Amino acid sequence: TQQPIVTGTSVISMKYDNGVIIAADNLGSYGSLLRFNGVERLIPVGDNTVVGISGDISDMQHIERLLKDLVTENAYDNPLADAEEALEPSYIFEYLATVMYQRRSKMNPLWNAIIVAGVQSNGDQFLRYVNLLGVTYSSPTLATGFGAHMANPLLRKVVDRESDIPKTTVQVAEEAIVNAMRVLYYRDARSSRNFSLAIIDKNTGLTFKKNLQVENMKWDFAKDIKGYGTQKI
């Protein structure tokens, strides 16, 4: 049994016609103090998988090392490590899902909420969630912590069910992700303006975008709001 110290907020994700998009901000919060601003919370494993981790940062860095060792271990005595026997998004998730549930059963959990986003070898989109309790689920849209309350409602307006996936393009999906990141910056007190965005497509491959910022913010209407009820000036 432990307690989270340095923490990362929401990890938001959705799947479109050709692949998946995942995003998380670059903040490392220390309670109410916004301590670290150069924290990458999206971890690319190979060229077909990106792992988005929220929660305890020290536990995240441990998972980082586990994923880098999984790449190293898979290449051992494997002449097809870059071809047929490469690490699939499903292999990466199931390993982490096993670890997360084993740790909670030993009463010493990794204080994290993880989304594994990628594309399988056959072209299928992979998007599954796993947390500190070992709870696993798949949905057209997935979000951790604060994003589950705010980003999910917005992203489900684009993809409400399975049939909406082939109807959604990269341009529409990314726009919905970027919009959700802006909304999270509005109402989440543990959020950063700077964020990373990763696109895993079955055609164009992995596209990792760094140092993105929340733009086109509405703040002008604040000048007209004065007092808290009866004050006029």
Partner 1 sequence: GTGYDLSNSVFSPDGRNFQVEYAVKAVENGTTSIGIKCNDGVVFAVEKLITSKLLVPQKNVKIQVVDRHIGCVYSGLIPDGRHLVNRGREEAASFKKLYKTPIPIPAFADRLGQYVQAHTLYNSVRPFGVSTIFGGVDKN
E strands, 38-111, where? Answer: 42-45, 49-56
Among 1, 3, 32, 76, which residue interacts with partner 1 (rule: CB under 8 A)?
76
Count of positions on this chain that bind partner 1 (CB under 8 A) = 7
Using DSSP, state whether 93 is helix, strand or coil: helix
Length of the chain: 233
Among 30, 31, 35, 69, which residue interacts with partner 1 (rule: CB under 8 A)?
69
CA atoms within 13 A on the CB side of 12: 31
Whether 1 is a known active-site residue: answer: yes
Question: Interface with partner 1 by CB under 8 A: which range of 48-56, 69-77, 122-130, 178-186?
Answer: 69-77
Contacts of 218 (CB under 8 A, 6+ apart): none
Q: Which of 1, 168, 204, 230 is catalytic?
A: 1
Measured from the CB atom, is 71 or 148 closer to partner 1? 71
Regarding 106 and contact with partner 1 (CB under 8 A), the answer is no
Using DSSP, state whether 35 is helix, strand or coil: strand
Number of neighbours of residue 222 by Cβ within 10 angstroms:
8
Measured from the CB atom, is 61 or 179 closer to partner 1? 61
Find tokens 């990269």 and name the residue. Answer: 170
Regarding 80 and contact with partner 1 (CB under 8 A), the answer is no
Binding stretches for partner 1 (CB under 8 A) = 65, 69, 72, 75-77, 79
